[PDB]
Design a protein around this ligand. Structure first.
Ligand SMILES: N[C@@H](CCC(=O)O)C(=O)O
Ligand SMILES: N[C@@H](CCC(=O)O)C(=O)O
Ligand SMILES: N[C@@H](CCC(=O)O)C(=O)O
Ligand SMILES: N[C@@H](CCC(=O)O)C(=O)O
Lengths: 308, 311, 311, 325
């Protein structure tokens, strides 16, 4: 028979979850779908405490024998943060597929309907198991660890320039290309099912004349971590170095990432802080927050940035 | 005979430690492309380049290009903020003579260092008469990028400088320049921005957009006297309820807010439902440069918005 | 007043069978942007479009643009060979009025079909005063590509039309056109090519380059009277010993040989030690179009090579 | 101690030289010996115990299936030895993706096989060959590189032989897999692995050519406006066993191409519909003649079809190979 798929709605312009389902009745030929309204917000207002609750609910659903996979509708702007959080914390090999739309549901040539169909097909395919959390738009299956919104406004915005897609959906058929060589889901050390709150982590940009006082402000409000969206390969001005050294003196963990959009920030002993490997600032903040729920050991956190 | 090209050095791994003359003598082939003079303007890693110094760089380039014995200028620079320096000069250099920034992703001592060929290409571009009137250029890895579109897209690769949606102005293949595009924007001799009499620039900071982004960072920027804030927003400059509160406080105190995007590419469109101006297709670093220069001429938000659509 | 735009239909799945008026009524918003008139030129899948028909298409567009009551033309077309038809008109249409090809990767009946918004964007482009004088354009997926640079890069995706090295002329975001580039090539009103009196075109075939590529395919093309051969070469138009023998036989019989590349992008540079001319950055399908038009004016290889560097 | 790596040289610009250092074209490929290349990069000896072997010295546009067959057989011999930990193969850029994918399907070992090439001749200013070779040796000698299929390394990137292609005629960064990305990257003397390909290769591949002396003939025909039926006739008459069609869009066929393919199939020729576009999926369509290439581009599709024809004539089996290899 058909796979059993829960469509868990959080908001986003792709949207009422039942209104969405009935607007795309073809999904009912791909799966037995049940809609659940988890929240209804624009994703720029999604917060870590709500994402935590999202992961806890998804873990509960996937523990059920009558649930084969979950599709999560979400706004595009921060889907990559929510998706990567669940990538590290969902303790199941059953597919979890985030889906979103770049055009509103009323727009001409709205992309939401076909994105949803594709997400349900992916979530219901036996071959989709064990691949980590996925993000599906525009016929592409992206890994939550590599995929990012690369363009403010286009349909094809979700890309992983250096890492490619896990697969594509063409002609109602899934073509799997890659498995990511990173830890996730069932292999992940992270289990947050007993957590109720998350560590505070802020992101500071790197640019000519970047100011020291933004580090001061972050320290004074009690951040546990700072992610630096650095110039080039996490390069730091003399002002940023002063700010990072002050932050580390107060026990704040600093991760140097990159503002460029892609690539590796390599280790460098003459610079302060840890390095983000190929994690962009938004993903690096998610991983650092979760790491800080378990450890403050810099060697462990640095390995996590190389392996997750 | 040969064009007269000044190689104006600011630092960077293409040299920074080595002096400009060490670079020239390491690549003696440049002397077959132009009569080259080295001038050491500074010698810093580009992450320490500052607006006050970029201001002086533009003023010095303007003096050089005013001379009849200078046909063009090649500016050696670190990769990390070359796109900020180049766009500043894109808007303030008052000449059609070529200004070409060049950089290297590998240090000059590395195996297969890219600096030598990047410099050779930059000199060929700066000395070609067909390069005039094209705006400020950034040359690496056989590519000629416009200062308005080109950005460092990768932390660590040789091919990092790309303009994903706008492409390259031209390419250099087999010792020949192939020009592909002219940028459909105002620059250089048609720009209203003139800083030849300025000594300082308005303070403009950049704040990131992300889940749980904090209001206090807006408070801190206001309390330290920023005149503008560039917001590297989620998606098309979308703003959380906390960012909205912070922007409303900044605007009440007269700070100009530009909504840009953290994504890397594309258009932030006007939106009546959100605070602030929009950055068009300017990324946060370029938006900060334009906003700083705009604030030297006006505080009218409708004029600043038009600058962002035309420069 | 609204611009007057003709929607000239040739086929493709954007109307897939379906008449042009049905497509217009499926996007009634176009009537708010322009006074539109549909004209059914043909109704075929674009893999069956032929040079003789493209010739007539070019002649009909020139007739329409000669009229004072026509401000621009949108041409609906299949995706598979739109880049061939579009580049042909890019070289042969004698007007600065916009000519905008539009297509769809999903059939008109599909869920989330891209045709309606592509058509709406194409009409917005064709009717905008800022769109004049830019050469022939191809509009899909919010992007405006030049017919000289744009190509179908993916067999099956909505975002397939890209120009990796040259970017887009502009984009359409939030019901507004953002122009980024003007192509630095000759086209339309500055093109030497005129086919308004022709009824047929010279025969030109394309042969692939690959390991073990066979000499007998050159023999066959010669025997069937080709006037030109475009070679989709390995790398930068590299040729095996078998391809060299085939090209030398073709050139001895007066066949003009153009070396292009199978790679998808970039410059095939001059190499006097290899037979034939080089395609500059033209891919094999575009190179065939230019070679056909070049042969209507000359058989001089030096002149043809200059065409490939300027068009 | 250090891994033992054989550098097996076939030719290419990476062994190319010229009269001056300013010409990046007009040089001559396959003119420097492998020991000249190794001695130009002596740092390789701190990464591995290296042995150079001159297999051939030709421009890769002249590489042929008969020689690629011998290359696969020689690499299999080398990797069977206990004193060989991996192999680096220097090769011209123009057809490295064909040679690499052939060995991807036929090498019967998990030890790394890494193809390396250069877009600038060895004498050029800022020549890329030296660092590409050092990266390839680092990759071939790392035990974490085992079991990943055959790799192609240039410009700090590790590409799978199944996805990587030369995308630009002339640039250093030409080797890309737009939709599938890189297996890994090499930054700061360190390898970062990102992906494992979800396809069959090497030790899990059914293709074995170690006893073969010849390969089936397969030609490639382009799809375009006015494409001629006579090229199909010519291919049939010269005895092709397979035809790969570099089709318009998603393997779409004109009325002339359809007539040609039906003639070929009536004569027993296997037709694979691929795409000239550069990327993406050619989907099944029973309304059209032939099999479909999945995401294989024409040059890769030709290699897989040649190897498929060494073991099967069953179209269901061949189509399944194109979906799984
Ligand atoms: N800012 C909105 C955009 C619309 C959408 O992507 O759904 C959101 O992320 O929710
Ligand atoms: N952080 C250094 C990197 C070296 C370089 O790019 O030249 C700089 O930007 O100067
Ligand atoms: N083969 C069809 C594909 C559908 C389309 O692009 O319209 C054509 O090019 O006409
Ligand atoms: N045609 C030459 C160029 C080599 C190269 O660029 O590596 C070959 O493939 O051998």
């Amino acid at each position: 028979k058909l796979p059993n798929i829960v469509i868990l709605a959080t908001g986003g312009t792709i949207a009422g979850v039942d209104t969405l389902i009935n607007a795309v009745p073809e999904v009912k030929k791909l799966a037995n779908v049940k809609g659940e309204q988890f929240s209804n917000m624009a994703s720029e207002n999604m917060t870590g405490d709500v994402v935590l609750k999202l992961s806890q609910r998804v873990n509960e659903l996937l523990a059920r024998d009558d649930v084969d996979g979950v599709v999560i509708t979400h706004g595009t702007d921060t889907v990559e943060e929510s998706a990567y959080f669940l990538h590290l914390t969902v303790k199941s090999d059953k597919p979890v597929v985030f889906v979103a739309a770049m055009r509103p549901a009323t727009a001409i040539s709205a992309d939401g309907p076909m994105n949803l169909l594709e997400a349900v097909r992916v979530a219901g395919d036996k071959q989709s198991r064990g691949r980590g959390v996925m993000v599906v738009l525009n016929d592409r299956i992206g890994s939550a660890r590599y995929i990012t919104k690369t363009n403010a406004s286009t349909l094809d915005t979700f890309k992983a320039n250096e890492e490619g897609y896990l697969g594509v959906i063409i002609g109602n058929r899934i073509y799997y290309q890659n498995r990511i060589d990173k830890l996730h889901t069932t292999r992940s050390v992270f289990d947050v099912r007993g957590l109720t709150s998350l560590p505070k982590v802020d992101i500071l940009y790197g640019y000519q004349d970047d100011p020291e006082y933004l580090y001061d402000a972050a320290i004074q409000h009690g951040v546990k971590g700072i992610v630096y969206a650095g110039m080039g390969a996490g390069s730091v001005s003399v002002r940023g170095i002063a700010g990072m050294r002050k932050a580390m003196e107060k026990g704040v963990v600093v991760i140097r990432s990159t503002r460029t959009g892609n690539g590796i920030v390599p280790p460098d002993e003459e610079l302060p802080g840890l390095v983000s490997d190929s994690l962009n600032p938004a993903h690096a903040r998610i991983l650092l927050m979760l790491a800080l729920t378990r450890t403050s050991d810099p060697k462990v956190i640095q390995e996590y940035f190389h392996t997750y």
